[PDB]
């Protein structure tokens, strides 16, 4: 029937507000925020070509690091900084194809599809090697916005990433199985996180990058052992908060 | 006739005779709690600033097309000296939390055609993106002055040279303007009414924000339907705005910012 | 336009930088100098209350458009730009079905009772301003004058009085 | 707020209505009208220069009679009456200067003020000698419309004026003050008189002056002694009907 | 005994406190500020050349004007001003003596004690005949901050200051004694006035005489007819506030 | 002792270890009841202006003589960009009534003598008196730079040339000395107090004021007995005060004033 969209809503109607007909709604919930945002996603990827028994050292091989920066949102080395930072934009690994892969990490599932400003959640995060060879790796994660501590070894030939009291682990062995999966909390202190844009500045000078908030991760995750690991993201106790628009997609 | 409204705060009050009602973002209000991330007593309830700010925004033409928009970034858009009490009170205080009622006002005729769309946007990009330069303070939180164009926020804008451009698909600060009737809004539909009333509640990514650093808000106004009216008509169209802070709580009493 | 004097002012399809008229908020302002408000307080010393400003818009009924009255109390002078006058006291009146607007000058006053003429203007005597500006251009179809009247006039409030009768000072009718 | 001034009447408003305001009247009642008028206004001076004891006869000199009509109203000898005549107009007395005085008496006060259109009251009326030499005068009071009785003497050497039962002063001497003070009850065959103008005429063959009632005033003063005397009317119980536009002033 | 002064008041003793002594309180109220300030005392003379059946004419002669503001406070022709305003200080009257008259009108007795900052009362005012001639003579007064209409007379002989609603005062004969009282109500707009100094300017744009507040008095005095007069003060149910210094005194 | 005092207000806190109490001028307080004059609802209540305002008042060196004084005219005083909010508040309103919490603060030694007069005096002349020239706007309401000399306002000060003052005997801001000690005071005695506690109500020739044409309150501070100190000892003693408005209500609200 009749409405003025001018309002700022209209009704939801079914087929029987204008015609001789029925509902016939069925009862779902997998559309339920929490539910579809709690599984496991690629996130991003991880490669070393250190050793275990060493002193963990940033680097980069073909866009790829050896720590990352836990955020759904595209990250990567921006200007030269010491380890991945929040990017405000998306690039191709290659400068020629205008085709992906992009060298920057994130939740593609995530980018394509937040349809909201702010989100809070826990972050199960899964790391899996890429290879059958046997794994002997240490993984060290930081909390958002801690010291990241890319100190020297204080005892030869031991992990430096395991001489901290931060969350670690450690596999290794033919036992293992060349995975490892752990939840940690958000650990911001924001109260919820920026989705996808962040309207502002992150220091008192207003010098840096516009567009990305302050202390907006889960932290960070430090590699060290030889290989290269891909990296997911399940979303624990997903809450969303004001709903936006969805990434444009092109016009079949 | 049940169109006619009026609306006070302090010494103001706005008037309307072709309202659709007051649409309540989140269907939610600031209500003025401090901050529990404060431990100051806030400075609040202050007369004088819970008030209507009235501006002139722009002259609607038949050149805008579908989706070109009119940004206002808050409460930056206030913190001049048209700003009152609350602009001298905001400029004074580290923190402020708010909420916003405001009115968008533009009169044609019934022989004149054409649609705006009013909204408000929380984390809506206010940058300029007629450069490739990086936004600054001074730059990123102005009221537009003139008419934005659509075609190039849609996949977002990067701060990158022209040429790298090319590898650069999308910029976390797009806007797919197809949805933008999902973001708290009301349409002014020049045969229907020549105003929109909408409030939004407080929301951030903390408690109260550092404002000198973020604009969380942004009062948009784009066309849906351009501008149509036959010779003879009246040819000036312009689309104005009445802005008030709801109940604005401060905190972190300091000398002014300049 | 040739300062003659009429019941009105004119707006049209513009917004001036600039009030379409300027009331200074005195008892003895010229331009309220024939009103039945003026004629009873000339006979009287102090005046305390509300003022109602009523405007009554003449254009077609196809006409529209958005005017901000605003009331601007003194000690910093008179408001040069919308950006000042709508910082003081200020009601936006939109035209449509009703074609009148009843605009109230609060009384704002450091004493309890203000003069009603003076020899010289003192902060007993004079009030401030009413300054109405168009908000949004008046706009209507092909077919309509572009000049639309609206009718000015003025009135103590619901809380208005008077005291102290006087004579006023004498003059040769013409 | 909004209203519709073409009903006839509007709302009379407050700050409250529009605005964060509180109402701020006080008590106040010198705007009766009843208050307001109760107090003494110059309305009329009159001369004479024949002496007590002689025949009453009617005489100006540069515009000042010895008898008075008793209105607030214009008065004057008109198209040389007998007696002062309710006048429609006011004039100069000078005929070059274009500047008062006037050669009408009214009560400047009253004329310049009066939005009614109808009035009834009581007449307070005031008389006093211009200059301080002891006064020795007798005055006549004729109630409205009544003869005038311009008669001689009866007896020798007698004021003529007080030769009559009508209501008559008489002072003189030393240990009097020079000036005379009554106060007259409303006499008009008139229930209300007008106060500026009557739309018709006095007289069934439409003859009169039109714009004058007929007998539109609280009687006449005729006075016989040597000096000039001014005269203030004070209206007593005063009650006013029908609002009506002030007289109207230049534009400053 | 001992105290402290810096505390910022001490105790009021009597002889007991120190000594074998007994207090001698007796009753005693003639101190109340109300008792003290009701009676009249001179503060003001003015003098008139002009008949009373003529139009009133603001002059000075020899330092009187035939007009007085009314207020306790020095008040004289300031910077060629059409009628009397408030002054800021004394003159004598005198260029070359140095010793009183002063051209300035006050009440001594006010100015040389006032050790208030602010006061609030009635006035009961007086006026007289400084000879023995009889007097003849006409007073208008006119509230604080009224219109002074020194308008042209709008009938002929008869005295301008009594074409008015405002009140005045008509005294004349043989019977009479020369002078004139009468007592008024406090008519500014001010809720009390200052009684020695007004730190400020009286309009918006400050260009006022700092030191004047606007519309401190209680109107003014507007005289016609023969004769110099003097003016006398009386404060009824007189109240004062904040305490302050009295004039200094050269020391003996 | 008991002579320790701290008094807070807002985020702002004095405190004083050689107190002799607080003096309530006229025994009364400002509660911050609106003017009854004023239809439009006053703006109160404003914690960002309910606070101390500290500011340097002068040196004291032993030249000064008894009655030698500083004035500071109220709100004048911090009606400038040092006032904070109070100030930015107080600009944009036409009215505004308040009272004064004070304390004037100054240290010397058990070795050094002399003493202060500290008071608050309603309509106390604070024009300038170095000049025969009128007093304006921008020269009427000026805290004092230099020691004002007592000689000159025993009998007023007439704004006329000096050969004209010969036949002017007495101006109406004469300030007669010695006996200021009638006005709400406190003294400050090198040899027992370092501050001063002062507070008076509100007192005016009307409801409420318009503050830009009237500085009703004057802070004094005056010489009682002279400095004195032996070689050897701290030649630098030094006047300071913390003002702070009691309860300010504003009304009028209106753009600000330059």
């Given at each position: 029937?009749?409405?003025?969209?001018?309002?700022?809503?209209?009704?939801?109607?079914?087929?029987?507000?204008?015609?001789?007909?029925?509902?016939?709604?069925?009862?779902?919930?997998?559309?339920?925020?929490?539910?579809?945002?709690?599984?496991?996603?690629?996130?991003?990827?991880?490669?070393?070509?250190?050793?275990?028994?060493?002193?963990?050292?940033?680097?980069?091989?073909?866009?790829?690091?050896?720590?990352?920066?836990?955020?759904?949102?595209?990250?990567?080395?921006?200007?030269?900084?010491?380890?991945?930072?929040?990017?405000?934009?998306?690039?191709?690994?290659?400068?020629?194809?205008?085709?992906?892969?992009?060298?920057?990490?994130?939740?593609?599932?995530?980018?394509?599809?937040?349809?909201?400003?702010?989100?809070?959640?826990?972050?199960?995060?899964?790391?899996?090697?890429?290879?059958?060879?046997?794994?002997?790796?240490?993984?060290?994660?930081?909390?958002?916005?801690?010291?990241?501590?890319?100190?020297?070894?204080?005892?030869?030939?031991?992990?430096?990433?395991?001489?901290?009291?931060?969350?670690?682990?450690?596999?290794?062995?033919?036992?293992?199985?060349?995975?490892?999966?752990?939840?940690?909390?958000?650990?911001?202190?924001?109260?919820?996180?920026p989705?996808?844009?962040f309207n502002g500045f992150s220091?008192?000078?207003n010098?840096?990058?516009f567009g990305?908030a302050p202390?907006?991760?889960?932290?960070?995750?430090?590699?060290?052992?030889?290989?290269?690991?891909?990296?997911?993201?399940?979303?624990?106790?997903?809450?969303?908060?004001?709903?936006?628009?969805?990434?444009?997609?092109?016009?079949? | 006739?049940?169109?006619?409204?009026?609306?006070?705060?302090?010494?103001?009050?706005?008037?309307?005779?072709?309202?659709?009602?007051?649409?309540?973002?989140?269907?939610?209000?600031?209500?003025?709690?401090?901050?529990?991330?404060?431990?100051?007593?806030?400075?609040?309830?202050?007369?004088?600033?819970?008030?209507?700010?009235?501006?002139?925004?722009?002259?609607?033409?038949?050149?805008?097309?579908?989706?070109?928009?009119?940004?206002?970034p808050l409460p930056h858009?206030?913190?001049?000296?048209?700003?009152?009490?609350?602009?001298?009170?905001?400029?004074?205080?580290?923190l402020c939390?708010?909420?916003?009622?405001?009115?968008?006002?533009?009169?044609?005729?019934?022989?004149?055609?054409?649609?705006?769309?009013?909204?408000?946007?929380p984390e809506?990009?206010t940058?300029?993106?007629?450069?490739?330069?990086?936004?600054?303070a001074?730059?990123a939180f102005?009221?537009?002055?003139?008419?934005?164009?659509?075609?190039?926020?849609?996949?977002?804008?990067?701060?990158?040279?022209?040429?790298?451009?090319?590898?650069?698909?999308?910029?976390?600060?797009?806007?797919?303007?197809?949805?933008?009737?999902?973001?708290?809004?009301?349409?002014?539909?020049?045969?229907?009414?020549?105003?929109?009333?909408?409030?939004?509640?407080?929301?951030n990514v903390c408690?109260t924000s550092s404002w000198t650093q973020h604009a969380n808000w942004?009062?948009?106004?784009?066309?849906?339907?351009?501008?149509?009216?036959?010779?003879?008509?009246?040819?000036?169209?312009?689309?104005?705005?009445?802005?008030?802070?709801?109940?604005?709580?401060?905190?972190?009493?300091?000398?002014?910012?300049? | 336009?040739?300062?003659?004097?009429?019941?009105?002012?004119?707006?049209?399809?513009?917004?001036?930088?600039?009030?379409?008229?300027?009331?200074?908020?005195?008892?003895?302002?010229?331009?309220?100098?024939?009103?039945?408000?003026?004629?009873?307080?000339?006979?009287?010393?102090?005046?305390?209350?509300?003022?109602?400003?009523?405007?009554?818009?003449?254009?077609?009924?196809?006409?529209?458009?958005?005017?901000?009255?605003?009331?601007?109390?003194?000690?910093?002078?008179?408001?040069?730009?919308?950006?000042?006058?709508?910082?003081?006291?200020?009601?936006?009146?939109?035209?449509?079905?009703?074609?009148?607007?009843?605009?109230?000058?609060?009384?704002?006053?450091?004493?309890?009772?203000?003069?009603?003429?003076?020899?010289?203007?003192?902060?007993?005597?004079?009030?401030?301003?009413?300054?109405?500006?168009?908000?949004?251009?008046?706009?209507?179809?092909?077919?309509?004058?572009?000049?639309?009247?609206?009718?000015?006039?003025?009135?103590?409030?619901?809380?208005?009085?008077?005291?102290?009768?006087?004579?006023?000072?004498?003059?040769?009718?013409?």
């Amino acid at each position: 029937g009749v409405d003025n969209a001018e309002k700022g809503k209209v009704s939801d109607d079914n087929a029987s507000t204008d015609f001789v007909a029925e509902p016939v709604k069925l009862p779902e919930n997998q559309t339920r925020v929490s539910f579809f945002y709690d599984r496991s996603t690629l996130s991003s990827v991880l490669q070393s070509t250190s050793d275990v028994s060493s002193k963990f050292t940033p680097s980069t091989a073909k866009n790829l690091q050896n720590s990352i920066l836990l955020t759904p949102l595209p990250s990567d080395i921006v200007n030269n900084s010491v380890l991945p930072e929040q990017e405000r934009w998306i690039s191709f690994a290659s400068p020629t194809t205008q085709k992906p892969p992009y060298k920057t990490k994130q939740d593609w599932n995530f980018i394509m599809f937040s349809p909201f400003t702010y989100y809070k959640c826990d972050l199960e995060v899964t790391l899996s090697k890429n290879d059958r060879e046997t794994i002997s790796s240490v993984v060290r994660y930081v909390p958002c916005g801690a010291p990241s501590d890319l100190s020297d070894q204080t005892m030869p030939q031991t992990p430096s990433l395991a001489d901290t009291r931060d969350p670690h682990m450690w596999v290794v062995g033919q036992g293992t199985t060349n995975q490892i999966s752990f939840v940690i909390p958000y650990t911001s202190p924001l109260s919820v996180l920026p989705s996808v844009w962040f309207n502002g500045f992150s220091n008192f000078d207003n010098s840096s990058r516009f567009g990305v908030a302050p202390n907006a991760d889960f932290g960070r995750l430090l590699l060290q052992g030889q290989g290269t690991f891909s990296v997911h993201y399940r979303y624990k106790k997903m809450r969303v908060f004001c709903p936006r628009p969805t990434v444009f997609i092109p016009w079949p | 006739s049940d169109r006619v409204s009026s609306d006070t705060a302090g010494n103001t009050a706005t008037n309307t005779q072709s309202t659709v009602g007051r649409l309540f973002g989140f269907g939610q209000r600031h209500k003025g709690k401090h901050p529990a991330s404060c431990a100051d007593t806030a400075t609040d309830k202050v007369l004088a600033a819970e008030r209507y700010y009235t501006i002139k925004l722009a002259s609607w033409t038949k050149t805008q097309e579908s989706f070109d928009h009119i940004r206002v970034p808050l409460p930056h858009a206030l913190a001049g000296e048209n700003g009152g009490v609350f602009s001298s009170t905001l400029r004074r205080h580290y923190l402020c939390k708010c909420g916003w009622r405001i009115q968008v006002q533009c009169n044609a005729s019934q022989f004149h055609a054409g649609s705006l769309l009013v909204f408000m946007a929380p984390e809506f990009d206010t940058s300029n993106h007629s450069t490739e330069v990086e936004p600054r303070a001074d730059t990123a939180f102005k009221v537009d002055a003139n008419w934005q164009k659509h075609a190039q926020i849609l996949t977002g804008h990067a701060y990158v040279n022209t040429t790298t451009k090319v590898n650069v698909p999308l910029a976390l600060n797009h806007q797919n303007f197809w949805q933008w009737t999902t973001y708290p809004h009301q349409i002014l539909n020049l045969r229907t009414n020549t105003t929109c009333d909408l409030e939004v509640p407080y929301v951030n990514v903390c408690p109260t924000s550092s404002w000198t650093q973020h604009a969380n808000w942004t009062l948009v106004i784009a066309v849906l339907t351009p501008l149509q009216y036959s010779q003879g008509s009246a040819t000036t169209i312009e689309i104005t705005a009445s802005i008030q802070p709801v109940k604005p709580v401060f905190n972190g009493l300091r000398h002014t910012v300049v | 336009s040739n300062k003659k004097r009429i019941p009105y002012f004119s707006a049209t399809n513009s917004t001036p930088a600039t009030p379409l008229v300027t009331y200074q908020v005195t008892l003895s302002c010229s331009c309220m100098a024939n009103s039945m408000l003026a004629a009873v307080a000339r006979n009287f010393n102090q005046y305390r209350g509300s003022l109602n400003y009523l405007f009554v818009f003449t254009g077609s009924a196809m006409t529209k458009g958005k005017f901000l009255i605003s009331y601007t109390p003194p000690g910093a002078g008179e408001p040069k730009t919308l950006d000042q006058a709508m910082q003081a006291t200020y009601a936006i009146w939109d035209l449509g079905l009703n074609s009148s607007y009843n605009f109230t000058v609060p009384f704002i006053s450091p004493t309890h009772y203000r003069q009603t003429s003076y020899n010289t203007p003192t902060i007993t005597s004079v009030d401030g301003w009413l300054t109405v500006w168009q908000l949004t251009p008046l706009t209507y179809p092909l077919g309509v004058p572009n000049d639309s009247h609206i009718l000015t006039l003025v009135s103590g409030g619901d809380d208005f009085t008077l005291r102290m009768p006087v004579t006023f000072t004498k003059y040769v009718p013409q």
